[PDB]
Specification:
GO cellular component, one term: cytoplasm
CATH superfamily: EF-hand
Protein name: Calsensin
Binding site for Ca(2+) 2: 59, 61, 63, 65, 70
CATH topology: Recoverin, domain 1
Distance between the termini: 38 Å
InterPro entries: EF-hand-dom_pair, EF_Hand_1_Ca_BS, EF_hand_dom
Helix content: 40-55%
Structural class: mainly alpha
Largest sheet: none
Main location: cytoplasm
Shape: globular
Strand content: under 5%
Length: 83
């Protein structure tokens, strides 16, 4: 009952830059967010063209980021497309 659902952002964040030293994390998400703070570059696939290279440094089978990241990273990505 305590609290609820929403802090899911704390997972990716706390995992994205909990210590940041040499592990692929949001450290790039910032660039992603800065490069497309509004995912205004997905659909076509201009998002993977940059993530694919960034994912090759940690994202090979789902290790880089798995949580709010996928939430926010998939939020617009999975939500992208429409009128």
């Amino acid at each position: 009952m305590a609290c609820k659902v929403k802090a899911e952002l704390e997972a990716a964040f706390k995992k994205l830059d909990a210590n940041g030293d040499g592990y692929v994390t949001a450290l790039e998400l910032q660039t992603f967010m800065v490069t497309l703070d509004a995912y205004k570059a997905l659909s076509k696939d201009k998002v993977k063209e940059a993530s694919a290279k960034l994912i090759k440094m940690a994202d090979k089978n789902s290790d880089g980021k798995i949580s709010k990241e996928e939430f926010l990273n998939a939020n617009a990505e999975l939500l992208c497309q429409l009128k």
